[PDB]
Amino acid sequence: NRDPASDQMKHWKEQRAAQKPDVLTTGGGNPVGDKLNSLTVGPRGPLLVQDVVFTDEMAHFDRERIPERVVHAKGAGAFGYFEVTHDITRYSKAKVFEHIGKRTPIAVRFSTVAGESGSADTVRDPRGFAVKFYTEDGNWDLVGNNTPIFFIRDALLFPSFIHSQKRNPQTHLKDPDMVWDFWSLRPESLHQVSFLFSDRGIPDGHRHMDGYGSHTFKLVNADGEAVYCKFHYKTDQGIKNLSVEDAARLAHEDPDYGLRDLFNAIATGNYPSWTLYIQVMTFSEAEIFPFNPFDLTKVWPHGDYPLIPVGKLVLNRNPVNYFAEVEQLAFDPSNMPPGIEPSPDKMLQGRLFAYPDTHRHRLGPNYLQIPVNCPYRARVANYQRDGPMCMMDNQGGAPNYYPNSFSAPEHQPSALEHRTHFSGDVQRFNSANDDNVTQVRTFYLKVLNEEQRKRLCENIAGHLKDAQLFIQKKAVKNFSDVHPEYGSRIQALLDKYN
Amino acid sequence: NRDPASDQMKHWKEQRAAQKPDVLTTGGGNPVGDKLNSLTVGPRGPLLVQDVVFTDEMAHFDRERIPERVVHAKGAGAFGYFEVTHDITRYSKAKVFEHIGKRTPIAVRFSTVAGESGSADTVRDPRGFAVKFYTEDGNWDLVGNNTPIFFIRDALLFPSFIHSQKRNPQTHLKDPDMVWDFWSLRPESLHQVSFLFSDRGIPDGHRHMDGYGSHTFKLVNADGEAVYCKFHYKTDQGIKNLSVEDAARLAHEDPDYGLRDLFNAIATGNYPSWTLYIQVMTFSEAEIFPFNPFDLTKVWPHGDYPLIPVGKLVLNRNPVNYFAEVEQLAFDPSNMPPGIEPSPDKMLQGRLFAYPDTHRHRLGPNYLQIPVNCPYRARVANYQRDGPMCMMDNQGGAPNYYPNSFSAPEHQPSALEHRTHFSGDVQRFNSANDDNVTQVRTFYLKVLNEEQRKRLCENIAGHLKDAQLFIQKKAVKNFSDVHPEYGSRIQALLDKYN
Amino acid sequence: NRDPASDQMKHWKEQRAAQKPDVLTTGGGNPVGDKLNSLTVGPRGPLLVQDVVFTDEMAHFDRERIPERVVHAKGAGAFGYFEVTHDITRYSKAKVFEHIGKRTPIAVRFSTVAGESGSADTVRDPRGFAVKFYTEDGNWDLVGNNTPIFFIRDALLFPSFIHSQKRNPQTHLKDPDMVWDFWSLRPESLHQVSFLFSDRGIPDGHRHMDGYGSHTFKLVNADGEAVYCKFHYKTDQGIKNLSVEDAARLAHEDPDYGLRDLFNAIATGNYPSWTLYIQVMTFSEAEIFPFNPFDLTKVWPHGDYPLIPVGKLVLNRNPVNYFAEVEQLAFDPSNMPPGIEPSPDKMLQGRLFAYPDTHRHRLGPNYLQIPVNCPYRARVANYQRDGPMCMMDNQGGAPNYYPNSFSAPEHQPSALEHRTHFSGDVQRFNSANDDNVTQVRTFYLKVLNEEQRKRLCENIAGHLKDAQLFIQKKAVKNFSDVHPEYGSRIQALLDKYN
Amino acid sequence: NRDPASDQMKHWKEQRAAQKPDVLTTGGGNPVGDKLNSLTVGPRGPLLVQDVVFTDEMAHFDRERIPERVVHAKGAGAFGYFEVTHDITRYSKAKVFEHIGKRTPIAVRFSTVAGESGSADTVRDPRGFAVKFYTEDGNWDLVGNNTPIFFIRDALLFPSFIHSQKRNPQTHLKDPDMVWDFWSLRPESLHQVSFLFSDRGIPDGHRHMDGYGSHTFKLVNADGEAVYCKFHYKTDQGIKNLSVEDAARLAHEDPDYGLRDLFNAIATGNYPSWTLYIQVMTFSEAEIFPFNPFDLTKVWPHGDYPLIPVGKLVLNRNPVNYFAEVEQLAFDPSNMPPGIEPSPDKMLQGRLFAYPDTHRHRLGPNYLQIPVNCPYRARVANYQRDGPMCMMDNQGGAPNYYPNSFSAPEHQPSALEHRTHFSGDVQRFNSANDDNVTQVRTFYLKVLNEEQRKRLCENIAGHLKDAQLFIQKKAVKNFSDVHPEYGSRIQALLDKYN
Numbered sequence A, B, C, D: 001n002r003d004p005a006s007d008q009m010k011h012w013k014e015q016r017a018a019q020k021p022d023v024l025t026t027g028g029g030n031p032v033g034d035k036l037n038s039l040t041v042g043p044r045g046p047l048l049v050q051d052v053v054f055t056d057e058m059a060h061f062d063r064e065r066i067p068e069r070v071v072h073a074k075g076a077g078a079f080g081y082f083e084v085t086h087d088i089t090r091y092s093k094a095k096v097f098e099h100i101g102k103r104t105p106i107a108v109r110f111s112t113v114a115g116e117s118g119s120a121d122t123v124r125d126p127r128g129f130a131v132k133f134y135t136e137d138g139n140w141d142l143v144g145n146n147t148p149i150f151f152i153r154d155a156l157l158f159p160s161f162i163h164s165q166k167r168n169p170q171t172h173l174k175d176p177d178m179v180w181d182f183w184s185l186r187p188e189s190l191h192q193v194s195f196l197f198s199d200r201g202i203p204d205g206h207r208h209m210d211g212y213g214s215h216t217f218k219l220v221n222a223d224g225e226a227v228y229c230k231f232h233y234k235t236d237q238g239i240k241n242l243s244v245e246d247a248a249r250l251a252h253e254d255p256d257y258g259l260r261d262l263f264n265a266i267a268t269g270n271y272p273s274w275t276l277y278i279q280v281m282t283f284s285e286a287e288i289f290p291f292n293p294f295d296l297t298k299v300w301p302h303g304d305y306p307l308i309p310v311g312k313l314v315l316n317r318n319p320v321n322y323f324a325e326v327e328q329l330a331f332d333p334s335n336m337p338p339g340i341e342p343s344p345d346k347m348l349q350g351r352l353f354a355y356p357d358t359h360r361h362r363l364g365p366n367y368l369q370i371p372v373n374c375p376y377r378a379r380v381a382n383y384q385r386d387g388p389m390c391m392m393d394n395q396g397g398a399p400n401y402y403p404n405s406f407s408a409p410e411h412q413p414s415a416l417e418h419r420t421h422f423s424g425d426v427q428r429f430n431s432a433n434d435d436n437v438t439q440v441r442t443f444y445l446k447v448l449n450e451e452q453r454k455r456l457c458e459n460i461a462g463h464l465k466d467a468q469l470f471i472q473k474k475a476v477k478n479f480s481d482v483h484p485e486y487g488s489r490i491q492a493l494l495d496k497y498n
């Protein structure tokens, strides 16, 4: 026959022999007599306002669309479980990790970053890989990317970043002057631009890319003892990327390639897994790391900070409804249950605010009562009330002020955050001159071969070539700065294009 | 001790011996350590963006308020049951009425009409008395008033009506020029203005007023046989009104008088009931009624159209949460289950549209999934999908187009509306000159005594007195038109004020 | 150099020698000191809540996206003028047409129909061609398509139609079972499916397709005299379509092909025009047309109803801001100024309601104050007040009720709609069995050659081939019904695919 | 005649002799023929969906209401000017203060705190007194109260505070158990509870109360030199309070008393003014003040910190439209132009976030483009784009990313915030045991007479009397703690009530 994505209504149906279709209703639950013909006066007369079946249905249609995600708009989702397989209780007191063999439910959305909702899956772009955990200490969202780093170290430059990756305000076209204006003007961006224009620029579907936490977290054990960490969830399927020729074909041939693939795997019993690892950095090694340990354009070298296994991530259930379980999923970085905690990472500190900020806009004030976003494995008790589309019982008649003499919920000291000491001037510190090339240099000399170096250059120039020459000029200087051949392998190509 | 309204937290508490308060969480379900002290650097330092407990909670606070109702903003609610006690199956095939002794669940909101949310209960104003029925054929809402008529016969004049009852666009004050400008300029308004300034202008709480459907419905039996009807739900408690002296005191002494009373009745076991009656008018008597049978400024005389009993309305359960079960209740006139159906009543035809229109604005696109507004006694199956704050499973993976070969819901012919014949020119027919006084005249001569006539005059002038004299002049002419003493009992008083 | 789309920031800049950049502010208008570095305690400390520059900017970012259009989501816009060139004042009293040589300003959005915002321009799909006119009698929107017909004759089937053209509720993929389930089950759809899979399925950009009003309007002259009409705006550029091979390339090579082209034309001085024609049908010819004159699956034959010239449509100004002048443009069918007026067309009667319905959702209650949607060539005076994001002066302190003694705006009798007579039973009339093939048959025998017939078959099957065989079976029967060779040229191909 | 509030439409009219009312339109600008009669088939037929005049108008009605303010919901506004009259340029480099005689435009909303929109003006409650300044360095909002202190020192307790001042979640009534539960459980609240139940609990209208900044700001001169400050704007009209007997009468007699008065003053030429003063506290006196200088339950004694004059606040223009210029005014604390700057005040630090947070909810993402909220005296240039109801030109085609090579706006170093040093542990510091009585004690012994002390007791108990006795018990202990007679003057009264 065909692939399961395709046999969907076929199966929805096959699955009801206990048929006799339900009665077609309005949303008030009133049964409908004819839903194929509006109510008129005479067969060629006008439409009655009394056709409250027409307006019910139409009124709902005209209201189906919610704003798409400001970034990472296009994606795929699925459900499965995280299972502990080693213990790190030394490091963390978090329930999710509390005992080998433990399983917590998880949801996952894969996505690209700049394309809007009808774009093609198979484009060079970073790739979102978000994991929501339904722990007993509430949800813990780990909003990762398939890259261990990023383009920038200060959240303040993010709007701009993204603006320049999107489209011209006048033209609505993608503009290389904007792409390359930004990047060349901010070379802290070289580390990841180097990751992006390499073979991993475009994964073969979601199942063949790694997920990284990128940021540095802080893990706190049951004694008050803290350490810094990095999460890596590696693919059990391997790395597999699509050549750029392969990607052009599929972008037209199957814009949704990655959704189809993810659906089909799971459907046929071929469940993707990823192994979750943590690198750990004590507070002292942190005082000596030759770089800012909290700098998103930086990785922690594995000879120095070897990876430690934590458990597995298995994806084994497809959505029944996309809209309701993938379009409405809201991942917040700030959803950290006791034992996990943010670091001074400038980029992380702004994600603390942004995610819930846009969730209240896109979805609504109360988007945490959306079945899928509900910490259902825990028990919510607080003094928050009311607000639009308030679904639950709104916590009944329980005292809504704190504190009170009437047995309403109480705070629990064992959940206090970890005491840490900060001294300094309230000022805005430059970070543009932190080291922009070392790690980059090595990446290009020792992490990537010669084929790859020839490739990462052609791909780069293949795009760069369309900015204005000034922009080229500056772009290449920066490249030149990371390694002289990086620079002039690129100029060579650019010359020949130009 | 005190009244139950007052012993509320006292009881909420008493009711948990199985105490040990719940753990105070964030909305993600993460447990909180200190909710009385924000996170700072040093005890006199600044507030960290990392206090994602502060912003969670605050973010929810700043979002608690939804727009209040455009009219009827202030009110009380409660739950109970409708029970059949006589059969009218001759007249109607509606399930709610299907068999003596049948009980359907109902909700009820009482309200005033012009005051905004913090106004006083005990003011002269019409009074909303809405009943939502959770029938098997979906919800059936009967959005009635405590008056059998209204001020106007064309929905097009409603915005204006209401604008003039509210406040000045510049001043934000209540303006008698606007009240009396409108009313005197539109004398179709005399019938109800006469009801409003009489002793029934202000009921003693909700429990001592009648509820009326006002409009003319159409009842259709199991044979295709139709008749026109009027619903009357009379108080089993009696009529009881508060003198205007009593009402001034309470407006300051207890702005919420009616909420307190309704709460307290039910709480102490004193359950209000109302007997529901129907007047019936055949299609032929309709062709001969000396007035427009479908004219909201008109009642059907009971010697001519005696009342027929239908069942009882008992209120026996108070809300646990006001916000969630009274502020979020949405009554739509258009929620008529098979066997009940609108008439050509101009005022009714516009309510068909307006209620769901503002419900999608105030509450949201999907306000019918709000637990209390859900036709829970029925089964919703249709082709509507998606939309903001989409709570259910969004009907899964079931075919979303109609028609289809895949067993998705189907329409049911037995729910077709009733065939009726209309012939005419598509035009806008005046209705301002329909009879504006007869029924009014009688009302004032034979329905109300002498005490009452002396009273309805003083009350009228007591307010009228503050418009400009032109407005008075016209106001009184109109009154003069309904009965010469109506007019000059009023001028007499106005002279003495002026 | 390069194409003007591309030299945009280059020109924005070149255009300011009167430079010295403005001071970068917050939205409160407070000047910013460093917008590249957040405010922290110590260079490696945490982010202060006092960085109200961070949250201002971020808060705005997280809120940039509004829901996209339920259909026709992806598009291009531009401004220009309509100019009268012949007079039809016999037919219409509309100011826009009042005198040869008259020019009214117009805006225009081109779009596809099913793809979401990041889709490819160059796909087989109908094509929106909307024209907003800023007349003195208010705006007149003519929301046309590049096709004179459509798939369905009853608005009630539209949600479904569209649902089946979009994506599976479970899978989020495009599903041929849904495409072909619908269409084969509703053969009234054959007329336009035949237009769609022919060479005009994909125009070469927007400039080389015709625009049609599709529906039948009613034109009313200065005497009260009415006639029925059809609007046709033909391209002065010619017809030009892209082969399907050409379209695949460009869908990947330049998803935005049509935006780029429209931008570039106008930018370089190559202004597209279209000639507007009207077919006219008297009320009597309407009583005899061998079909329902008001049936969207039907054209009025030009030998019978020759076209009459009206004026020209010239596009000569590109947007400065896409978001603000193309994403926020709202076209409402119901925006008909005196002299133009809807017919009993079932599809038209539902568009009366739907457009403003979704505009109040997507844009907001007051989306008619969005500069571009403002009838700026007229003067708005009414009794509507208040509402969210109320921009103007809200009409000051002017009486807000109607009628009134205080000189507030008044209605004008000369704008009454045209008296017309309707007689019949209030019922829901089938329309599925109206003639589904004749016009189709001719189309295929005499309107299209042999090359074209060979092509329209291959294209059809080329897609059809992926439904389940039942669906094929039914699809082909229908085709067989319109002409036996239509049917079996298709079966032949399908056999060879299958 | 009568008061100007009352002669409003009378004047609106009188003011147009250049009459001939405008033509009544729809919002598309289409002229209306009959707005008093809907469109039907036959004079007693049903309502046509083609009455797109009905739905336009109705659709707008059903959408008029926006959520009211979470607190301070009910109020009055007006416009005028701030004028410099002494120089404090030593202290501050802010343009508003730049030179004696300077005048900046200002807006002002007065309000109460707990009542919802239809409540009575003349109730015991704190009183909002907000001032928006349209300076050249953007708007500077000074969101003050008529009290120099408040009930709490940590924003985290605010939701709760407010919850307990409002109504029961079950009952919707005002509950003294909640009022007095909170307050007695948090005695830091004694300072202001003492202010609130004294004669200043209820001002005689807005014109006879002082305005205070309450919080401690930081003033920074042109050298980088900082100092801490407190703003006091004293009434030039004097203090005048209404007895509680007077207030009961007016609450029923004229719920809007304060709006009427403010309107009428200004209208008749009687312009209220207030003199603005600043107390200054060097960073060193701050290191020695025997209390937390940044503690909202604390004033800075004037013998120690004498007041220094700054300029005058004159109110001289009433709104034309209330909705558009008072309901839609949005004051943000965070709107501080260079030279003014927040302190470590915990309560202030949370207001930084909250105001704009709820403005984006109530009004919308872009509420700063609402004419009245627009920093019109400055020039907004930034990288923020798009968002719902985006009114301006959205800044055209100007580069939307930062930084860029294309002359788009730039940041200005002279606007950097003031360098300050903080050292400490990231922890949550208690503040409940800071001194809760001293200042209170004095207040009651030396600031208030004997009449007043007898009064402040009766008023207190007069309300307290309705909590449960436990609550009383604790309440009085606290009072006892501030002065033994405070406590037992109260017990005496409570005994006699009880």
Ligand code: HEM
Residues within 6 Å of the ligand: B068, B069, B070, B071, B072, B075, B109, B110, B111, B127, B128, B129, B130, B143, B144, B145, B150, B154, B155, B156, B158, B212, B213, B214, B215, B329, B330, B331, B347, B348, B350, B351, B354, B355, B358, B359, B362, D062
């Ligand atoms: C053209 C005529 C009328 C129109 C368009 C209209 C419109 C409205 C609107 C927009 C609301 C607010 C509902 C909400 O926001 O949830 C409302 C409330 C209400 N109306 Fe009407 N109104 C009309 C006349 C009447 C009449 C004649 C009655 C009495 C039979 C009535 C009874 C009510 C009641 C009881 C409520 C409050 C519902 C509740 O308690 O939730 N109205 N109306």
